[PDB]
Amino acid sequence: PPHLAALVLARGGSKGIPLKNIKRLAGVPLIGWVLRAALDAGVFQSVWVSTDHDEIENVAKQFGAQVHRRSSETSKDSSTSLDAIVEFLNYHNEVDIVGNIQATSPCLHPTDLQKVAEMIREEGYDSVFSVVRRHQFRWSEIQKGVREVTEPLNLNPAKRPRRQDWDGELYENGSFYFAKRHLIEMGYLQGGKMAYYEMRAEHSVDIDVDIDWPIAEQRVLRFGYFGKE
Amino acid sequence: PPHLAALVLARGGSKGIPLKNIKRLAGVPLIGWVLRAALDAGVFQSVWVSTDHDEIENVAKQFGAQVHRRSSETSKDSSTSLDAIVEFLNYHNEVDIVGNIQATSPCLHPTDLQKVAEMIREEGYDSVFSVVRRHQFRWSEIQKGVREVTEPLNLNPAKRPRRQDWDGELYENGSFYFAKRHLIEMGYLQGGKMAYYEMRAEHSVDIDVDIDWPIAEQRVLRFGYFGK
Ligand SMILES: CC(=O)N[C@H]1[C@H]([C@H](O)[C@H](O)CO)O[C@](OP(=O)(O)OC[C@H]2O[C@@H](n3ccc(N)nc3=O)[C@H](O)[C@@H]2O)(C(=O)O)C[C@@H]1O
Structure with a gap:
């Protein structure tokens, strides 16, 4: 079957607080939250992390994630997610499907990643x-x-x-973007037989959206996945 | 000068656990936050609180807000704001402008209220x-x-x-709705010479949004107005 690779882009020069991707949130460096749900999903053929920094590489490896090194060209505030995603595939042919997960959404649970994998596996999305x-x-x-x-x-x-008188509207929350190789290798992060996956508002609050890191820490501790019970 | 009244609708029923409008947030009952910003703005000819519960009336008075005892018909889970704001005015023909402020956005600051008040003066909205x-x-x-x-x-x-490639979009945040009597009377909270007031993100997180009440507690502490 296809090769579903979890990919978490983690550059070194973040906004405001530098090396934000491995900053400890609730005692765990950021990428660790998302990587953990990734691996515990047991749905990926490989869990990767694309970085350009030695410390991010280490942390990534500590969380049992494979690491791919790159320059800072795709780490610029003008760069795009597709830029760094192609940069990666251009090195791993075995990869048939890319599950791009953002570390800035630490409240991801393996359950959701399992159902999305099933949407692609079963309804051929x-x-x-x-x-x-x-x-x-x-x-x-x-x-x-x-x-x-x-x-x-x-x-x-x-x-x-x-609020209970109308469905609201649907907005991307930044959590994850799953796409087939032929799609990314065409310029579309989303496309083809497209589908969205509605996650719970408790897991959708972005780190940069909460504004304060500690309020964010309060959030992840209340709604995040801490590993196997 | 036109009579500018602050109006905070606070009914006992809160879809779920009641008295949420009087439930302590960061040590102070919810309506207190908004009331404080209101009073300290020094721009209202009166600061009111419309309620149907005794407990909420007391707390309201402790914060130095006048209290209007609402009718049961406008205090229902289905009762719209317009119905309630229109039931209030029925008893205050002395009010020309209603500054409807929601307690569910406790990170309000008097600075924003003063600027909106002024918008209604110069730009005459x-x-x-x-x-x-x-x-x-x-x-x-x-x-x-x-x-x-x-x-x-x-x-x-x-x-x-x-982010740079474009400008986002504007959504109401629930913070406040200022409207002239003639608009309200004809059933509109927003109409006539309409204008919006863009507030800082840190002050736009609704209570129902954060979900976890304690989370809102840390938010008001880090981004609310503590009087003085
Ligand atoms: C002006 C207005 O329409 N406010 C409504 C807001 C508004 O749409 C959002 O803030 C913006 O997204 O949405 C509602 O928000 P909510 O139900 O929480 O109500 C806002 C506060 O106002 C009080 N209220 C409102 C109407 C009324 N007749 N009596 C009242 O006491 C409540 O006690 C509550 O604390 C919602 O649908 O859930 C209902 C509110 O009435």
Whole structure:
């Protein structure tokens, strides 16, 4: 069967706090959360970590992840996830399907990764990515050259609905992006027979979105996977 | 000057565990946070709290907020804000502008309330509510059975933008809704010369959003307004 490789891109020069990817969150360096759920899923043929730093390589290896080294060319704030993902495949042909997991979503559980693997295995999906449901109203933005005018992009102001009165909308949460080789090797992170996977809001809060690291630590300790019971 | 009243709707029933509006958050009952920011703004001719419960009325008074005892019909799980704000005005024809503030966003600061108040002066707006910027890609949900597919409504999967490549989108954050009497009376919280007020992300996390109440506790401590 195909080769499902978990891939976690972890550069050294992060935003604000440098070497953020191995910073301890709840006593465990970041990449460790996601790598653990990855391996415990027992669904991948290989769990990788693409980095450019010696310390990230070490931590990765401590968590039983294979490591792929690269330069910082795909580690720039102008670089893209597809950039570094191709950089990787261009070295491992055995890899048929890439499960790109982001360390900035430490509350991932193996259960979700197992069901996505099954969506691809069973319903022959080409690409699958994590999504989250939200119930927040959207309003235009005063265009350039001003004019001043907002319009309800969602609701009808005459009748504002309660949150339990309407499905919300679906937004990617950044957790994971699964895609076949032929797709990534074409420029699409998502495409072909596409599907999303709705995860629980408790697992969707991004590290950079919580803002504060400790509030984030409070979060992972309350909703994260700590390994096998 | 036009009468600007702060109005915090706080009913006893909270879908789930009741009195959530009076439940201590970081050592102070929820409505206290918003009330404090309101009073310290020094921009309201009155700061009110509409409730249907005694306990909430007391706490409200302790924070130096006037209290309006609401009718049961506007205190229901189904009762919309407009119904409640409209039931309040029925007893205060002295109010010209209603500053509807939600207790469920305790990281409010008086600075934001003062700037919105001023927006209503110079720009002369009929309605101004709080909003927040987010950069999240939206996707169509599957329905109508069959092998239905999800579609992008926000971006182009072939070319996905970067944070810099584009400006996010504006979502209401639930913080506050300012509206003139004539708008409210005609059943609109947002209408006439409409404007939004973009607030900082750190001050836009709703209670229901964090889920874990304690998480909100650490949030108000690190990002709330502690009076003084
Ligand atoms: C102005 C408005 O429409 N506020 C509604 C907000 C708003 O849509 C979000 O904040 C923005 O995403 O959503 C709701 O939010 P929620 O139910 O938590 O209510 C906000 C606070 O207002 C009080 N309230 C509201 C109406 C009413 N008749 N009496 C009240 O006492 C509550 O006690 C609560 O603490 C929701 O659907 O869950 C219902 C709220 O009424």
